[PDB]
Design a protein around this ligand. Structure first.
Ligand SMILES: O=N[O-]
Ligand SMILES: O=N[O-]
Ligand SMILES: O=N[O-]
Ligand SMILES: [Cu+2]
Ligand SMILES: [Cu+2]
Ligand SMILES: [Cu+2]
Ligand SMILES: [Cu+2]
Ligand SMILES: [Cu+2]
Ligand SMILES: [Cu+2]
Lengths: 335, 335, 335
């Protein structure tokens, strides 16, 4: 029984940050209470001013990451302001039953509902808006994020030994299908429903116009780059609700990677590139051993550097000449 | 030595059912005998009447699923009626040598042949047509299915614990490449050969016009939906001979999943979505805990809901409030 | 300390061969010294005379495979001759730091540089010309290969049992984006620079015009086929620097398969089809049990048989009827 466990409330933070949380916890099963508000909005998605008629949780792509522990219960209040055009609902991949919650959360504009489900399974899980068997749209327009259900005992390697991250980051990869006019420039829509027919048509082509990390081309670069330092251990949570992707850290690795994102299975080690299946979320742990500016990307490099699926990590610390050294700098070829 | 062993005869059932079989067995190596007849035919593949000049094993997509046990010998008589136009053959991914049988099963129309092979490795394996010259086409037009080679002792988890399913279902997902007219509507061909040139042209674009489970859009929906009940454990065999896919069960999971579909390896638990590599078949077990109508799909949702890679499972039983509760129904937002 | 270790020189060999090397070794850590010279050249990539303005390490696609042992140091001198027209660098997926060595190997035509890194992790790793955050033109144009870091002890099955191969072969799968004219025929470019704008544009569509193994359609067939014999065990190293592939050996398997290509991880057995992620290199082991002609291919059959992703292995030895026998040859259907 669940109506009698201690109810707690979590303040959510917008990506790429994850709300503060305990890994291995002394604590016992709780009900964790969260609130998310759907926000439909036109967002600028690239540097030449192209816009998406987007649909977000809490006004960001991805929605924020929800952290709990195995055996906890998740209790969500989903809010659909009257200023929105469309109905919404939520399918938690971590939940069990009634289409992951979607049947119990159909909120029209100006409505709200509260769902609870047991987080009986550990790993990173996608949550995303739902279609009644209908051409996605809501999903690809931005309605997804991650639920992370940590093992009560912390993260464990294949031999059972414990693993701890100093900090977790969350990346949502969105394949966008922005329509083009006869002039060959991208279309700009006044309202959401205006964008529908043209978008559906682009979707059939299975060819994203852009693929972005966290809402925008270059969203995780420059002033907004991720940060860590040598010796630090990061957990990179990668969600892709609709399409396969292949994450990679440049001059880095995946020390321990759950590419299927299910913590009960033994992680894999030493990975150069791993694979997030469309409609799943995986996680990777890396301990930085060198300073400098790393890139973190989808290693279809067209998708990365031509379509937008890439970001940076700025790393403080001491250069290690053992791991890598420049024996001879670029110089003219011997006469 | 092979001829010595008992020769038994299986009569196959059409998908989505799997022919009655024993999981864990006390029997010893038998030579299991099957017959499949190649049916060339035009089939209606969607709700708006679009046709496919199809090629099939036993007049269905996929072919029926052949079940044996590790160490059994598979003996297939392959019939190519005089009424067909094209030659055929078969490649079992489960067999060893001569292109998986293909070089020894080259039947012209009005010919038949009999191939035996040792089923020495266990798992779900794709079988597909594989002539000289024109392999993809025969394959994409519908000529694949699954051979399930069960390990002699039944299915085992990573610890060695025994695993048992109550009913098994076979889903073959087919990426279809139907040509279009200059007026934008799908072409309708009088004969199979007339479809060739136009189809190949669509094929080079690597973009399916449709992607269907078992021969058509909504083949596993409504009256034809898969059926189960709370406490039942199902094996969902998923084959895709030509193209990657990523199966998911909405508000379900894979309790145990061999995504590469080879049973000697340890399965994975708690998967939200798994990945069937093009030209492979995989398997997942799930034990239902909630009633209702589940959706089984390719979790590229464009491919699912727009191109047709989706089906339903209708689940009988009693709602478990512990797993999920609608705390508060969709009401107006408080002031 | 590295400078005080023995320095050895390796002569590199052209694919599909891998330079002579020891699997399990009693030798201590060494600094293994390599030289690669970048060559930009126009190449014929299909049977119908289509050309690619290519870029290569050592005048081949892929670049030669570099073999070392866990604990060794790789020391590459990258030579960019004054005969080339573009700058180049190198990113080793098996290196830690500075975009995998890219930031310290930027050589303008007529320059060269020398890089050292510690091969601290075991597996097959891609190396490729680094695109410092730009459209991956050099990559898709041919600039990648594998670095194999063998564990010092040899390869190990999931139980710790030792595995050994008689020969290793390296296949680099390249997805090409050759432009077309208004007339519908593939373009031919006078210089490499002239090919840029048009190519980038094809790339944006994510649809390769061709997908070739080792630098052209049928490059590993006929006189150039891979060769083995019954009882021989081969390592098949498959790299794809930019796009997903799914290798399969026809009427063959992957006895042990590191599809993520990292040897410190348990391999999987009995695979019909494996999955190399774009931006990674995987390895498979197979012991031939039947003679004849085999096809090694991408099991997206459109990509294999129409776009060019397939090769052949010729296998010597004696047919084994227990594994597979032709019971009745193709002959008229009886009454
Ligand atoms: O390792 N990305 O070039
Ligand atoms: O909405 N697919 O879980
Ligand atoms: O097994 N490829 O036809
Ligand atoms: Cu929505
Ligand atoms: Cu979903
Ligand atoms: Cu056929
Ligand atoms: Cu095949
Ligand atoms: Cu280069
Ligand atoms: Cu790379």
């Amino acid at each position: 029984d669940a109506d009698k466990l201690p109810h707690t409330k979590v303040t959510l933070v917008a990506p790429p940050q994850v709300h503060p949380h305990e890994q291995a916890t002394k604590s016992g099963p709780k009900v964790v209470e969260f609130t998310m508000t759907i926000e439909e909005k036109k967002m600028v998605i690239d540097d030449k001013g192209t816009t998406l008629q987007a649909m977000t949780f809490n006004g960001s792509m991805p929605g924020p990451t929800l952290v709990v522990h195995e055996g906890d219960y998740v209790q969500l209040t989903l809010v659909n302001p009257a200023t929105n055009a469309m109905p919404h609902s939520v399918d938690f991949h971590g939940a069990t039953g009634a289409l992951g919650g979607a049947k119990l959360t159909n909120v029209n504009p100006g409505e709200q509902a509260t769902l609870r489900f047991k987080a009986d399974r550990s790993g990173t899980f996608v949550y995303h808006c739902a279609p009644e068997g209908m051409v996605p749209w809501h999903v690809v327009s931005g309605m997804s994020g991650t639920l992370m259900v940590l093992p009560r005992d912390g993260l464990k390697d294949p031999q059972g030994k414990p693993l701890h991250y100093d900090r977790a980051y969350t990346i949502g990869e969105f394949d966008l299908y922005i329509p083009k006019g006869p002039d060959g420039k991208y279309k700009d829509y006044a309202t959401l429903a205006e964008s529908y027919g043209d978008t559906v048509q682009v979707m059939r082509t299975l060819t994203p116009s852009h693929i972005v990390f966290n809402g925008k081309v270059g969203a995780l670069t420059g002033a907004n780059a991720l940060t860590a330092k040598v010796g630090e251990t990061v957990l990179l949570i990668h969600s892709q609700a609709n399409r396969d992707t292949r994450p990679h850290l440049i001059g880095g690795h995946g020390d321990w990677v759950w590419e299927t994102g299910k913590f009960a299975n033994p992680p894999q080690r030493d990975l150069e590139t791993w694979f997030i299946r469309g409609g799943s979320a995986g996680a990777a742990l890396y301990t930085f051993k060198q300073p400098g500016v790393y890139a973190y990307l989808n290693h279809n490099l067209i998708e990365a550097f031509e379509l937008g699926a890439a970001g940076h990590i700025k790393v403080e610390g001491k250069w290690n000449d053992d791991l890598m050294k420049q024996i001879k700098a670029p110089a003219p070829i011997p006469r």
